[PDB]
């Protein structure tokens, strides 16, 4: 299946309370592998997945210096944006940056990303094909022109289409035991008497990886959405994910409903039906 | 591996 490497950066100004907070997190697919937190005591980029620990001191020293340079740049940006938008230094603002790359099943580059946001809204991003910038407003236009004068877009692409893909491949290989794993969902169905005329059927998918999954209900062989509830896919806290779909059905008509589960780890989609 | 050079906005 496809893969991706993503870096997420969050910088928050903290008016008169020291330096802004800077947090950096790297993922490969749905697996976090590194982190940096300006408030943490180490002041080091740290491993969060087992396979990355095979990288040597040179890698950690370099990633630490780079993320620190990143922290400084974002710290300056907070002051610059405040200026662009003529905001006060007493207010807390947030800058977020995400960049990374996607590869197909063959591990060949599919697309890259470099997006920037100020206070939760798009500020400036590189377009889908990476060949131009999208600027939200005049403040972002100012950044856009500075970036086009420094050929930042071409600097980023060299990385997104090369370096980024190269490191993603390296990590996929080094952490093959877990990154290229496919944990099919453990499934089951529960039943609850809701009332004098209703019963709830809950279809569970658990301990699955990657996070991408599809859970759907059907009644009499037809897609069922009425009186259904589907929760956002969530992390179990052990590297795997969980998700469920429930439907309220008339008492006694339980077996006319079926839950269907599609996940990469399943050679075939599973179908669950209530067996009392 | 992270980007090395990042330009201020």
């Amino acid at each position: 299946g496809s893969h991706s490497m993503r870096y997420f950066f969050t910088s928050v100004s903290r008016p008169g309370r020291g330096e802004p907070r800077f947090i950096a997190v790297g993922y490969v697919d749905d697996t976090q592998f590194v982190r940096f937190d300006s408030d943490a005591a180490s002041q080091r980029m740290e491993p969060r997945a087992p396979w990355i620990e095979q990288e040597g001191p040179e890698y950690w020293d370099g990633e630490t210096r780079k993320v620190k340079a990143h922290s400084q740049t974002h710290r300056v940006d907070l002051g610059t944006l405040r200026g662009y938008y003529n905001q006060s230094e007493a207010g807390s603002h947030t800058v977020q940056r995400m960049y990374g790359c996607d590869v197909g099943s063959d591990w060949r580059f599919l697309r890259g990303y470099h997006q920037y946001a100020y206070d939760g809204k798009d500020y400036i991003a590189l377009k889908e094909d990476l060949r131009s910038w999208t600027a939200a407003d005049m403040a972002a236009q100012t950044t856009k022109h500075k970036w086009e004068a420094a050929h930042v877009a071409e600097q980023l692409r060299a990385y997104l289409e090369g370096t980024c893909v190269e490191w993603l491949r390296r990590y996929l290989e080094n952490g093959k035991e877990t990154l290229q794993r496919t944990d099919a969902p453990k499934t089951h169905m529960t039943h609850h008497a809701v009332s004098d005329h209703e019963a709830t059927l809950r279809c569970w998918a658990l301990s699955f990886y990657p996070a991408e999954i599809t859970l759907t209900w059907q009644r009499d062989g037809e897609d069922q959405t009425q009186d259904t509830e589907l929760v956002e896919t969530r992390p179990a806290g052990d590297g795997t994910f969980q998700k469920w779909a429930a439907v309220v059905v008339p008492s006694g008509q339980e077996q006319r409903y079926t839950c269907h589960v599609q996940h990469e780890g399943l050679p075939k989609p599973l179908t669950l039906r209530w067996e009392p | 591996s992270l980007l090395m050079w990042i330009t201020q906005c």
Partner: T-cell receptor, first 112, second 115 residues
Framework: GVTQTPKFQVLKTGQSMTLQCAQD?????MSWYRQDPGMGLRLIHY???????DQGEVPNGYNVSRSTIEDFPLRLLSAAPSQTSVYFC????????????FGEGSRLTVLE | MKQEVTQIPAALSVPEGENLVLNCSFT??????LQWFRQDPGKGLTSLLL?????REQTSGRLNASLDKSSGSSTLYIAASQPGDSATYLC?????????????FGRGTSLIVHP
């Protein structure tokens, strides 16, 4: 631009001394070099961010600090005649063109 | 991969008016930029030009530098050389990927343009 001070200094062997270097360009990167007459630039220490410093080619006998983005002082712990040289501070963005900006230099002479 | 910058010629002595060509070669093509400076005896460094893999040429008066197609060399051209041009021309490159940001300087080309 980059402002180094002092431009000239005479020290007695064993004296401590701090060279100052400031820049108002919000350059993330600041660095110190020494260059003996007719020789090449040798990196002493550098800094990519506040509270982050790294050793260059010749860190022995020198200490630095990066408390603010503008300032990057160089401290000569205990002046020695071997430290007589011309010191240069250089800063840059760690993005944009990465162009280096040098200070005017500081000529230091340590004597017994 | 350890970067190594070589400048040829090491010394150059010419009569004024002559067009000059200074070379700055480097062993690691992965560079973020290449910068030329001039340094006069007992003085500091003055930046002359700054080129990058995405802005491969820059002109400043009678000076123009270019980052050659051979992804490992830069040439500095000094048109109609003047005695005021006399100085040591230094070239430095910065790393694109090593995460150190440390520039690597060449030994320089000592130029004397005779009046």
């Amino acid at each position: 631009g980059v402002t180094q001070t002092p431009k000239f200094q005479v020290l007695k062997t064993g004296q401590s001394m701090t060279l100052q270097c400031a820049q108002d360009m919000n350059h993330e990167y600041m660095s110190w070099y020494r260059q003996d007459p007719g020789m090449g630039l040798r990196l002493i220490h550098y800094s990519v961010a506040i509270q982050t410093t790294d050793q260059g080619e010749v860190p022995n006998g020198y200490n630095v600090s990066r408390s603010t983005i503008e300032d990057f002082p160089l401290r000569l712990l205990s002046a020695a005649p071997s430290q007589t040289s011309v010191y240069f501070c250089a800063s840059s963005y760690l993005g944009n063109t990465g162009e280096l900006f040098f200070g005017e230099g500081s000529r230091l002479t340590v004597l017994e | 991969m350890k970067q190594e910058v070589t400048q040829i010629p090491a010394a150059l002595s010419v009569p004024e008016g002559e067009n000059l060509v200074l070379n700055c070669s480097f062993t690691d093509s992965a560079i973020y930029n290449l910068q030329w400076f001039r340094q006069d005896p007992g003085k500091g460094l003055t930046s002359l030009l700054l080129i990058t893999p995405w802005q491969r040429e820059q002109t400043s008066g009678r000076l123009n530098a270019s980052l050659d197609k051979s992804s490992g060399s830069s040439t500095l051209y000094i048109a109609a050389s003047q005695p005021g041009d006399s100085a040591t021309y230094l070239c430095a490159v910065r790393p694109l990927l090593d995460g150190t940001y440390i520039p690597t300087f060449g030994r320089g080309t000592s130029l004397i343009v005779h009046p």
